């Protein structure tokens with residue numbers, strides 16, 4: 001055991017309300033690593049994951065310290081805090097967004113772990129990992145990393161599932177993590193949008209289900225764009241540091257481009273599926289106003 005394991009194991013886990021992890025506008029800047037650890041335990045607990053799958057407290061905690069340990073602090077945006085936020089947004093979309101009741105326990109378990117794991121050991125967008133010839137290279141690696149951790153002694157938070165469940169869960173986790181390739185998202189979103197405009201959308205279909213989960217993954221991953229302006233500004237600043245340092249005049253422009261190309265349609269779609277995820281669409285719109293205005297002062 002580490003000092004850090006003992007502390008987190010021995011801690012008390014505040015309520016979801018106390019931790020604020022149910023608000024789409026949640027933010028982590030004032031939180032310590034430990035407090036994120038607790039927030040994470042709180043997420044598994046309130047989603048019924050510890051209950052329904054008999055996770056030993058020490059195992060869960062060890063699993064989380066592991067996940068956290070395998071993000072790089074030296075990377076400005078793509079690090080534990082981003083993974084932590086992705087999962088918190090997943091949580092909020094499940095509870096506040098009233099999406100929990102459209103999905104199976106196993107899907108949820110999988111989405112949460114996927115959310116936490118989907119960028120494991122990421123080195124910043126400007127860094128290269130070589131192998132043979134290239135195919136979501138990165139996301140395949142994040143998944144490997146994820147599985148390694150899941151399979152480590154002391155960290156096996158899935159021990160409590162039958163093989164059948166276990167296999168199912170892994171498949172979902174893997175697909176979730178791979179959905180975080182923006183390339184995959186652009187290939188697949190057309191179909192998602194068609195279904196919506198043609199009133200055809202139906203979650204009871206295996207194929208559409210898997211697609212929604214992919215969409216849901218991307219929505220949480222990009223959710224920083226939906227945050228209150230003072231927070232969105234600060235994240236944009238982290239993203240900028242990773243993009244360029246590892247003028248700032250071109251940035252509000254890129255942000256508007258990013259929102260137009262990628263984010264608005266998605267959060268519109270997600271809002272059709274669930275009217276209670278509107279707060280994300282709303283946030284994203286406000287931020288577009290903010291960035292556009294700036295790009296015009298340029």
Ligand SMILES: CCCOc1ccc(S(=O)(=O)N2CCN(C)CC2)cc1-c1nc(CC)c(F)c(=O)[nH]1
Pocket residue numbers: 125182222224225235236237239240243251254255257258261262
């Ligand atoms: C403000 C710094 C620049 O911000 C961006 C600039 C360009 C584009 S992009 O969509 O045109 N395209 C995406 C694929 N690669 C990255 C090539 C560029 C995205 C962002 C952007 N991305 C994310 C997701 C990581 C954010 F969370 C965020 O705030 N900003």
Ligand SMILES: [Mg+2]
Pocket residue numbers: 031032033034
């Ligand atoms: Mg700290």
Ligand SMILES: [Mg+2]
Pocket residue numbers: 119180
């Ligand atoms: Mg990514």
Ligand SMILES: [Mg+2]
Pocket residue numbers: 152153154156
């Ligand atoms: Mg063991």
Ligand SMILES: [Zn+2]
Pocket residue numbers: 082118119180221
């Ligand atoms: Zn990500």
